[PDB]
Design a protein around this nucleic acid. Sequence first.
DNA 1: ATCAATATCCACCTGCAGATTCTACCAAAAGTGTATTTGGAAACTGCTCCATCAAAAGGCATGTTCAGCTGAATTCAGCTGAACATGCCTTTTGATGGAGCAGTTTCCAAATACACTTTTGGTAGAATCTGCAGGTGGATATTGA
DNA 2: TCAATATCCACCTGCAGATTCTACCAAAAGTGTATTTGGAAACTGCTCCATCAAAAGGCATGTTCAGCTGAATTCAGCTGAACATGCCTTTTGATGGAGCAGTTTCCAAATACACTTTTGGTAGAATCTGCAGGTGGATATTGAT
Lengths: 96, 100, 79, 83, 97, 98, 93, 96
Amino acid sequence: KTRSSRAGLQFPVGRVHRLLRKGNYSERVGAGAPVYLAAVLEYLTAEILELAGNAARDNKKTRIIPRHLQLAIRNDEELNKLLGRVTIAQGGVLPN
Amino acid sequence: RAKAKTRSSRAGLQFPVGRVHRLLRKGNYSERVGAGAPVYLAAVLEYLTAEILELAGNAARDNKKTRIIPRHLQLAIRNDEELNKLLGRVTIAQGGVLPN
Amino acid sequence: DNIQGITKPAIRRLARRGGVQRISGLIYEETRGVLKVFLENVIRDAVTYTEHAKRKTVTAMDVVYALKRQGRTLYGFGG
Amino acid sequence: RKVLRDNIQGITKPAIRRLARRGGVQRISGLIYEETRGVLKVFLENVIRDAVTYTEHAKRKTVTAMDVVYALKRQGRTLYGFG
Amino acid sequence: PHRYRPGTVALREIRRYQKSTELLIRKLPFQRLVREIAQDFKTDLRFQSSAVMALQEACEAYLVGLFEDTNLCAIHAKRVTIMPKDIQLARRIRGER
Amino acid sequence: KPHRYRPGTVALREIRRYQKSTELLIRKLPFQRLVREIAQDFKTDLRFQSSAVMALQEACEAYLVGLFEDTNLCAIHAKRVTIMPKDIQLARRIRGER
Amino acid sequence: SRKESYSIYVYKVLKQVHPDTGISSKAMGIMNSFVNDIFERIAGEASRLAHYNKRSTITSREIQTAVRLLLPGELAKHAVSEGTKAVTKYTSA
Amino acid sequence: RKRSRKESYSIYVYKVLKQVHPDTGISSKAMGIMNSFVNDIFERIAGEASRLAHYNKRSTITSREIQTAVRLLLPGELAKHAVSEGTKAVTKYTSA
DNA sequence: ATCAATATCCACCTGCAGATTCTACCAAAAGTGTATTTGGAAACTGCTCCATCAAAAGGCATGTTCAGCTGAATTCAGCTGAACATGCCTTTTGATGGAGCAGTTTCCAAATACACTTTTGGTAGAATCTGCAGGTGGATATTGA
DNA sequence: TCAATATCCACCTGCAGATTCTACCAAAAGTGTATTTGGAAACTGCTCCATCAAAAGGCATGTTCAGCTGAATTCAGCTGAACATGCCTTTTGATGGAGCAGTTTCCAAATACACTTTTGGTAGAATCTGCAGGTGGATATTGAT
Ligand SMILES: [Cl-]
Ligand SMILES: [Cl-]
Ligand SMILES: [Cl-]
Ligand SMILES: [Cl-]
Ligand SMILES: [Mn+2]
Ligand SMILES: [Mn+2]
Ligand SMILES: [Mn+2]
Ligand SMILES: [Mn+2]
Ligand SMILES: [Mn+2]
Ligand SMILES: [Mn+2]
Ligand SMILES: [Mn+2]
Ligand SMILES: [Mn+2]
Ligand SMILES: [Mn+2]
Ligand SMILES: [Mn+2]
Ligand SMILES: [Mn+2]
Ligand SMILES: [Mn+2]
């Protein structure tokens, strides 16, 4: 089967690898790099979706929309710092 | 065979076209690099350094010194609106600040 | 007089999302000026990407890229 | 080999005063000196954490000026002159 | 004959607008502005619908943020009324000036 | 009889002076010591190239001097001449350092 | 023709943490922008790390030092965790 | 043991120096800065060049990439002049 | 409307700690012949993008009116700068061992480069479905008294 | 506190716009092989970092004092919010046409390679010299009266 399933990841290890090669980042790419990088991307994705999931639940909503991603991010010290120079379209601003 | 002539001389430049053409390939910027690229970059690079040395050299003169030092560089960078913008987030070790 | 198109009330609203409660009468023109420099800077970079690509249509990506280099990274329009 | 402590106090009131001067500051409140020490500690920790991260990755025991130059670059405080 | 006290509505709009996410600059005028500024860099240009929308999004997000910092400056001056000097100081500490 | 400069006269004199020079203003050793103390709290058994400590000081002073310029703008904006923590904080807040 | 995105992978992860929560198109746009961004930031730093050290190959070691440099404390711990975990589980198959 | 050569831009900077200011020197500490300057702008341009190329699914960086990287990177006048000098060198170079 | 104080300036001086030349290799540009591609031409073609037109529908431009905010004046407790005596401890010079970078070699585990095989993910027509945007009716919050 | 006016808040409700869902095919992604080579040991030369000594004078400390600055208070002009009005610019939306992004489809001009010279640069010797920093008048610049 795929390397992702092998790494136990949802994210596309193979693609991350193809993307690391074609992106002129280095001449070669260790076998692990793709795996690692994909694990990290999935985790963070999970984190935001987890928080924005709650964002919609606390809003009596079942479908996550931008507003939710924005509320989850700005209301989280760490995510907020990681994305301090990023603006999420149609996300508005924290109330108060 | 024929005699060697450096690409810099061919380009009419003082900066090292060959070296730049090399740093480009080794810096993993693209699969491949065309003939002009380095010529063009060495030119731009040489032009900007002529520009700050012109203004720096004047700074030195204005301060009655014949050898440019970091403070002369700062004076040149901060008094020139464009250079200042270009290096607006660069800090010149030992250059102080403009007397405001 | 297009910049005049960005109207007072529209600007009042922005300030309001900004949490501003009282607005001096001179903010309106002051705001258009900042607003104009902002678009000029972003667009100029954007259009430069357009021409590089030899196209005649500014694309959302040409804008996402401009914003990225102005340090105004935007999510939602192609990365 | 001795324990290091309270060295933030090595940044003396008069030293902080001279910096405000180059900074164009005319008058200084009594509480500035400690806010400054506070702000300098944070700035430093952040540059050193990164520099040292750069150091370890190079599996070294000595922080080089390049380590610091790279650290500063990441922080958006590019330094010329040791580069 | 009912009337609201100065700024009672003001606070109300803040509550309103800090809760929604719609653009607050009308589309058409904004598009007209974008194209006019653009016509100074390259002529007869076309625009993806989405490019114009991205610009407005970026733009408004920026303004709302600058009004945030501006209000901080007005409050620093023990005022409740933002003024140009407030926008000016903010932009200078931000490095845009 | 004894001569005595009025409050602030020496201060502007000091500004003219330090804005003219480029020497560091924090004492070398005290500072190197502060670096080692912070470094060590992150990683033990660490060595530093001489220039590494100077690079750090150069950055620190360049940063503190620049922060004080903004801090001063904040004070003047408050119709004050005496910079205060409020100011340093307003500056850092807009600088996006907080 | 073809325009790949991380949408599917995002959606999987979504269901894994909120089985009954859905996500709007625009929102998926934000998550893609997100992934691409971090992807670039991580790769970029790893790229740089190798260059500083005259290495020609970006290995998982580089990716993680890069992760420590980019991510805020806790976020970086977990990211390093999931990371070395996935590599581990992979080298055991 | 061979103290492995460390390339610099010193001799070129110095050459250029003499051109604009025939009787002016430069302390080693200023050459320090001048070197940092060159490497910096070099990285910014190659960087923007690299990216421009990637955005256009183009595998090779050419003088055109450099040029538009320059226009994106430098302000007004500085840009107008740098582009001239580069074009001038490129054509000079081709005609030789 | 000085003028005694004392801080600042600007030119003159000259040994030496750094800058500028002087040699020698040798690492890395150049020169060549050869094999591989990149990415501009030209017709082409679906497709978004633009120009109309057509309604209402708001939503913005206008003036009035006056609440209450800002900025000007005046006041003074006490914070913060200037001076000064004291003497700590940063600086400056110089020597020393040895940690630990950094230069070489040696040479496998791991990565690149085909060639094929599958498997997957993106795309283009069909079945739900989540809220948006209104109702209605009910306490709330706000302003006038 | 009363009382009228508006707001804001809830709980339902029904439909249309997006989501989901379903059914298929190049284009990556996984394999299996044969080579290539990056850079991890295993040394080990030797640069330069941590320390130790010692002496000295630049500066950091602490304290005394009172100039004048920040923080209250007041208060009056007038600027900016709330509003009910009236009109017109924006919004909605099929329509129809056309400029144009993308596609292929070529291939001649332009990189990449691989060797094989041929210098340009760089690391210390060696030869020079700004200018640091020491002094002294003369020139302000200040603060007392
Ligand atoms: Cl790896
Ligand atoms: Cl080219
Ligand atoms: Cl103002
Ligand atoms: Cl304060
Ligand atoms: Mn000249
Ligand atoms: Mn009144
Ligand atoms: Mn050893
Ligand atoms: Mn499938
Ligand atoms: Mn609703
Ligand atoms: Mn090898
Ligand atoms: Mn003492
Ligand atoms: Mn008193
Ligand atoms: Mn005052
Ligand atoms: Mn056509
Ligand atoms: Mn030679
Ligand atoms: Mn002197």
